Amino acid sequence: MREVISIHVGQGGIQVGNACWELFCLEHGIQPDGQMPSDKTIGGGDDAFNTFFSETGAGKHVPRAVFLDLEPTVIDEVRTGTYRQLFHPEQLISGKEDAANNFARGHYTIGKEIVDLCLDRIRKLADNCTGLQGFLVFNSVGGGTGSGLGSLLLERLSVDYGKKSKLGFTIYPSPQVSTAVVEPYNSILSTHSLLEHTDVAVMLDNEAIYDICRRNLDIERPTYTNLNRLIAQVISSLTASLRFDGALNVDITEFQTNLVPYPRIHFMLSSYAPIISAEKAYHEQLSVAEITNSAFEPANMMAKCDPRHGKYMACSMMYRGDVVPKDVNASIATIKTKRTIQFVDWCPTGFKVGINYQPPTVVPGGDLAKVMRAVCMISNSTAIAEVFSRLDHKFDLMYAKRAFVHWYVGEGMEEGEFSEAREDLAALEKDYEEVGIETA
Amino acid sequence: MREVISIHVGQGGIQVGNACWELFCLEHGIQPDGQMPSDKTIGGGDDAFNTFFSETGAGKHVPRAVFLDLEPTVIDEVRTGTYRQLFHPEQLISGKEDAANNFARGHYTIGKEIVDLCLDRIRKLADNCTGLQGFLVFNSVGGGTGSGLGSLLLERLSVDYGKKSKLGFTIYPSPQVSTAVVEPYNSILSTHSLLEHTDVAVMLDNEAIYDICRRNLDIERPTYTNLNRLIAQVISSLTASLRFDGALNVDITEFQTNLVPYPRIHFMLSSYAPIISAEKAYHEQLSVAEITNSAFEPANMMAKCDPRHGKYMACSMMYRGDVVPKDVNASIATIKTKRTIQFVDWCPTGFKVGINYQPPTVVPGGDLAKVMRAVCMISNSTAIAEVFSRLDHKFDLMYAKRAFVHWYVGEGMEEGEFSEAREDLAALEKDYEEVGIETA
Amino acid sequence: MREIVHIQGGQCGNQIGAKFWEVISDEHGIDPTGTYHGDSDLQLERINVYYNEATGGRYVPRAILMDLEPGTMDSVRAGPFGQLFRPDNFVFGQTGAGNNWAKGHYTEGAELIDSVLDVVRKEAEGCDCLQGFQITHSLGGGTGSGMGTLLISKVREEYPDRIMETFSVVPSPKVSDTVVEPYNATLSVHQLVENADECMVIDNEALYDICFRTLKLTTPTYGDLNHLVSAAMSGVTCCLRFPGQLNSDLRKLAVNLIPFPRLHFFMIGFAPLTSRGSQQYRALTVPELTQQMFDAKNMMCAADPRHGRYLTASALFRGRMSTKEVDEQMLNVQNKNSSYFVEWIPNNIKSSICDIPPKGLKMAVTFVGNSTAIQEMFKRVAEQFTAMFRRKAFLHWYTGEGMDEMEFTEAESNMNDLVSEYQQYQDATAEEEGEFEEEE
Amino acid sequence: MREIVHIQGGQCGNQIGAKFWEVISDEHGIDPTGTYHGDSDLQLERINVYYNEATGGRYVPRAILMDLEPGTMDSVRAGPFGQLFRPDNFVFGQTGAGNNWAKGHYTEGAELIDSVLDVVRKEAEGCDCLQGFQITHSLGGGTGSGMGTLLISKVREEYPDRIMETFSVVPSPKVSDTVVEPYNATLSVHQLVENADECMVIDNEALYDICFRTLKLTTPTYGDLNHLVSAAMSGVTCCLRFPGQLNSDLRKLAVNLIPFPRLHFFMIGFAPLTSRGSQQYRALTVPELTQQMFDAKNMMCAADPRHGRYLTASALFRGRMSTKEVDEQMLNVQNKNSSYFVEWIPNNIKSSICDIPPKGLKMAVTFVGNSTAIQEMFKRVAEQFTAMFRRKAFLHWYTGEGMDEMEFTEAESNMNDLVSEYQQYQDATA
Ligand SMILES: Nc1nc2c(ncn2[C@@H]2O[C@H](COP(=O)(O)OP(=O)(O)OP(=O)(O)O)[C@@H](O)[C@H]2O)c(=O)[nH]1
Ligand SMILES: Nc1nc2c(ncn2[C@@H]2O[C@H](COP(=O)(O)OP(=O)(O)OP(=O)(O)O)[C@@H](O)[C@H]2O)c(=O)[nH]1
Ligand SMILES: Nc1nc2c(ncn2[C@@H]2O[C@H](COP(=O)(O)OP(=O)(O)O)[C@@H](O)[C@H]2O)c(=O)[nH]1
Ligand SMILES: Nc1nc2c(ncn2[C@@H]2O[C@H](COP(=O)(O)OP(=O)(O)O)[C@@H](O)[C@H]2O)c(=O)[nH]1
Ligand SMILES: [Mg+2]
Ligand SMILES: [Mg+2]
């Protein structure tokens, strides 16, 4: 019944997760103990949670989510947190020693010990689930665990569960702002694995979202926690159709058909539009036709790819709140007419629209305005190519010197596995232009 | 529905703006918060504001107005002002460093950064607007920002929006009283740009309006703030037709047809007539026929061009209040008969009359008498030439010496641009005599 | 923002700086311990222009106190408001310049500046937008002239676009408190005229003249001479720190004060200064203050404007005055002084208004006037320098440090060229009759 | 877990350790009798990293205090927090090295190390997951250099995978508090470069310069010099002991600080250090601290990074800072220092955020930088060493302990190769 398993791998995966499960808990009305208070004298929001939470039968609801890390510190922060009693102790899997920003540790040395225990946990969670919709996965491709083990997970899952969709929300390293020096090496080796085993991969570059916080929320000094909250709001809005009733319902299985035209082109961007500081909410009409325009803004994209270079191959607008289908119709129609927004020829009708009546929830201590409308656009754009080429350029500077290879090779990755990966990503950015080429 | 976007560029622009939006807020009944108090138990002044204020849908009205300055000080004053909660934060755009009375800085160096952000704002406002009438623009041509960036805007606006009329209220420097030494240089470089991109340009020389205050309001020591209030009343009286109901309605679009005979001759003057101190309002009849004669008074012109030298190519009388069309008809007929007032041959019927039942509002603290009749006469006059000849003479003294050029050249402007500009203004003052010449 | 880094270089400079940073702390309400005990919120809106907010809400001057004499530190620490300045920002040698440009420019000073730059760079990079610098140094003594010029030369190579403002005490023949002044000052102006945007020449003679005539002080001390300099120093850069009816800034003054790049020496003056007995009688009105500011007596330079002819001027009126009345006065002044204003470049006088007055006053003015009178004060230094340089007197000190006679010649040449140029601005007025010249 | 076994070898090492184990005790709240008196439960959540919980709720440092001189034990007992250390862990000889690498390596020290390894093994086996070691020795003195290198050689043969971190005081030409320093140090680096995963070179000269300039101390003592080294030593391994917005550890730093195995010499530097008088004026902001950490003055090594070009750098920021603001600053630095960053391997600076600040501070930073500047400090030692070895001066001592001239030539040969390799990756353009 609309069940979604959430796999949070690596620090960036877990900490994004925390923020997701705050939002979900507030949305369905689950308290930190895991017990919804039985109010309104009717089960009014009954079966809403069954997407994300499993009723144990005693009144306590447990998140259907495996938090995985090779490092104990991030998962310990969840165990000594407000939501300690919410998450199943076995679901929160720990490792003694971190991958230390080395794919090789995450994919062979350390990863192969833990992955066995994780798959068992996923199977137990999949057995409870009746008509599972898909596997949401959260991994940082800049980091060791999220790259290495996160890739190994997806490979193993794809053999075990087969058809069940795997929507991956990946935190690709922004080109200007990078946290670690060995990030390219990880990213490239991760992408090759990710390029086969995921169905749809939603790219999110930190720097881009940082800029959105400074621009829309008007915060001079944004943190990761502020960022993770915006990421959550997107995920919520995407899975919303399952959880809450709507006019035009979507599903996690639908995107995979409507957004990916060819198998390898599964990379996407995302843009939640009405990101507004309550300070400037006062002065904004926030009609549907504005929210749509604000979605297709080159700035409001959460990955730092300027789609004006590319051509939109397919768009998936996911509206929430006081949204009328007629109003949406005009808004798309005006976008289709615009010049700045350019669509591929072979896609004559590239929009999949998804209207829910449920408005988005305002998290307390949260940098956002309570707003009666919203939209999360997941877009497949030829522009995505740009991010890959930069990570290729930034990678090719290395491996010319054999810059940091001695680490990766020591930990069981043969040197030709780097050469392979680059060759396959080089084959991707070939494909992305080939589809961008007008029909002959 | 009669929407007008106001673009306030440069100190002179913004400060004039502040005074405009006080008046508008009072006229429609918007309080500083931006919430009209719902009184008379009916929406009686409902949709009057939709000219100048967008409803947000929550009971807050925001001004459709972009305030733009390369300097932070003037826009800050608005942000730390009574109307802080009225204007949309984003609509108030600020620069870090001023153009410093240098067209060049505003048109190339500093401008090119900000204009990008400005146009985005104008697009967002024009999306909300359904059947936009025109862009009102407020820029000083003596000052850097208003000359430079204000000219760069209009250019960009002309390509993007196209037909939509661009009425420009420009504070040309009075010849006797000049605030800055480098004004002529700015004005001429500005006028060339302005000469092609604006539809109608209404000229207002401070000194002239200063004299009106000393003559009509009987103030020994007028300020800018006293001046700005008279400018507002004009703007109000021009747009009035849209906002309030009238017998003979006009529109911003109409002036462009009835006042500009030839494309390049779009320079005008303006004269709001019943400017009366409450002290002498006691002793005056203030009949329509008087108000009209008072409009065509050489002195009561707000630009310091004595129209007795020139021939009136087209007039646009805009009456407000206890005004009878029969009473107007006689008033014009007597003006047509007068000798002092002289009309070009090729214009047989020059007058466009506009009658509004709504009387003008008395601003509290305002140097004006509450009056039951009024008129704003925008007049295309051959006399305008005179102002351009004095700004050409005052510039020709310069650029003989290559006086201040180093600055302008240093900031990107090629020297030859100055020569081009003076050559195009000389071509204008050729045209202005050519049309003045009786028909062959 | 528009922040200003201050460097107070050489004994004189440090003592001027000491008084200045007292004067500005009164207007901004900062107390000697760096706490804010001002009554108005207008005092802390733009403070960042001069102070860099330290932790625990202390305010610290963005001053760089440089000297080659360690004694001066004790002097600036002895002063009230001595605890305001940052220890790190204090940079002091050991030996001293010994009134020797060469010691302060080529040898002793040449070792120190490297250390100073590292501070300059540090405080300049902290500013989001740097307006420029205000250097306060004597041309007469070694340290202030030697280092001062060497620093100025350095900062300009690093920060070309940023304004370089200098408040320099030129040596007066009347006082002559050092023998080798002519040498220091001649070698100084060479370096200043190439690397300073706008230099405000101050003279002790004039300052003493203001103290024995304009004011009636029984015992004028260097304290009282510094207090007049500091008053003016505030005036030049107020419309940054406070609102205005018409705003200005350093760059705005430069653009309208410097017609050609080389003529950038000005005569600062302060208009509301009155003898304490003569207060009753004097009426504080815009006309009254306008009379004093254009009295040659008021100027803090030895050369009387009467001999020269103003190329331009600038007034920076303070307090609540009618802009019309100001403009009337500035016009009135230009009609009177028909000879003392250059023929070409009409409307010579610029006028800025700032709303906030100086403490304990209702209105004030600050005057900045580029004349060809300033030439006269430089001729005095030339005549004196020549007379020494005819015989190669005292030349063995400078030559000892490693300076070469060639330098001394080029310095004289470069100062003679300045003197020729300022005289040339009377030959471009000598245009008068196109048929024949006035000399026959 | 991720436990760290500290070895403080040689007088210099024992005195650094003394101060280090005081500094870490304040952070974790442990009192000088081994009792926890801290106010925050965060102080004990990851105490096991450094301390091993003894019986009766006493905390014992996992420190192995080795020296060939028995007089040093008295010194580490004398110190406040001298009762913390385990009397079984203290392993001391009688004679002493006599500032002789050979005596500390091949003879006197060769007899002791077998006793120390038994303690190392014991403390290493107690840990469920050993992160690695943090050896603190001096390359200059005979004990710290002789035994230190010999132990490092041994521990690595038993524990290859486990990180070997070293905080080594290199002899500075300015100070020159021993004559035979060049010999000891040259023979040391030969053993260190083969067997140390990450070496953080410290210099007394630099530490004195931080004490006279950055701080303004009238009388800087070896206590104060040790306090700065200790402050940094905490920073390098904090994200183990406390939570973080972005976590790191010793292996993570190593993976991102060492491009090629032989280039594992780094310059450590602590940012929030200020003169006591200048504190009022200084503003404690991420930009301000980032400006001090990259200042060549702040580094605890003689060689200015200005001469070299950072192959990479790492920052370990402390307290509550917006990660965006940090990231803005690290980017800003790399654009500015276009020359001082290697062309190949872009986004050279790594950043780590730890939520818990150091005691009595709101924000802090620790800096670890692999530059080609570090070669300049090793050239000083080489130039010095050569001059002695040209004549075979003081060589008879080292030869007397049973070291052959062949060893002195291979040590110089191996140190010159290091200097050649840094200069390669400085000059290289890609
Ligand atoms: N949104 C978000 N991204 C984060 C956060 N922390 C880290 N990241 C991302 O993850 C990258 C660093 O990798 P980590 O997530 O620390 O690595 P990991 O997958 O946990 O694996 P190890 O580093 O081996 O422990 C950064 O470059 C970011 O892109 C966070 O709090 N929020
Ligand atoms: N009506 C009116 N005109 C003003 C006002 N302030 C300035 N002006 C006019 O504008 C000229 C000065 O230009 P500014 O507006 O200061 O300059 P700007 O275009 O903002 O550009 P910058 O000076 O570079 O900031 C004067 O000569 C006046 O003609 C004001 O408050 N009201
Ligand atoms: N206005 C003013 N001038 C000063 C002061 N102190 C010194 N001077 C002048 O500065 C000149 C010498 O410069 P000084 O800075 O003392 O020597 P330096 O230290 O070698 O540069 C003398 O001719 C003095 O008239 C002061 O406090 N105020
Ligand atoms: N920073 C620091 N260095 C020291 C200290 N004590 C000794 N050293 C240095 O260590 C070197 C000699 O090493 P030492 O440990 O005394 O001899 P060992 O015991 O034989 O290794 C000298 O060059 C000293 O500069 C100290 O307390 N702090
Ligand atoms: Mg991690
Ligand atoms: Mg301005």
Residue numbers in the entry:
A (entry chain g), B (entry chain m), C (entry chain n): 1 to 440
D (entry chain h): 1 to 430
Q: Which sentences did the original study use to describe this structure?
A:
OAD preferentially binds to MTD protofilaments with a pattern resembling the native tracks for its distinct microtubule-binding domains. The OAD unit together with the four binding protofilaments (OAD-PF) was locally refined to resolutions of ~2.8–3.8 Å for most structured regions in MTBS-1 and to resolutions of ~3.8–6 Å in MTBS-2. However, the inter-PF angles (defined as the relative rotation between two adjacent protofilaments) vary substantially among all pairs of MTD protofilaments. To preserve a stable parallel architecture, the OAD stalks need to rotate with respect to the MTBD regions to compensate for the inter-PF angles. This is enabled by the hinges between stalk CC1 and the MTBD helix H1. We compared the inter-PF angles from our OAD-PF reconstruction with that of the native MTD protofilaments B5–B8. The overall patterns strikingly match each other (a drop of inter-PF angle in B6–B7 and an increase in B7–B8), implying a preferred inter-PF pattern for binding the three MTBDs together. The α-MTBD/LC1 complex requires a wider inter-PF space (similar to that between B7 and B8) to properly interact with adjacent tubulins. The additional charge-charge interactions between LC1 and β-CTT may enhance the microtubule-binding affinity of OAD. Our structure also reveals that LC1 contributes to the MTD protofilament recognition via its interaction with adjacent β-CTT.
Thousands of outer-arm dyneins (OADs) are arrayed in the axoneme to drive a rhythmic ciliary beat. Each OAD is divided into two regions, a head that contains AAA+ rings (rings) for ATP hydrolysis and a tail that holds together the whole complex. The tail is permanently attached to the MTD A-tubule, while the head region of each HC contains a microtubule-binding domain (MTBD), which binds and releases the MTD B-tubule depending on the nucleotide states. We reconstituted the purified OADs onto MTDs to mimic native arrays and determined the structures, by cryo-EM, of free OAD and OAD arrays bound to MTDs (OAD-MTD) in two different microtubule-binding states.
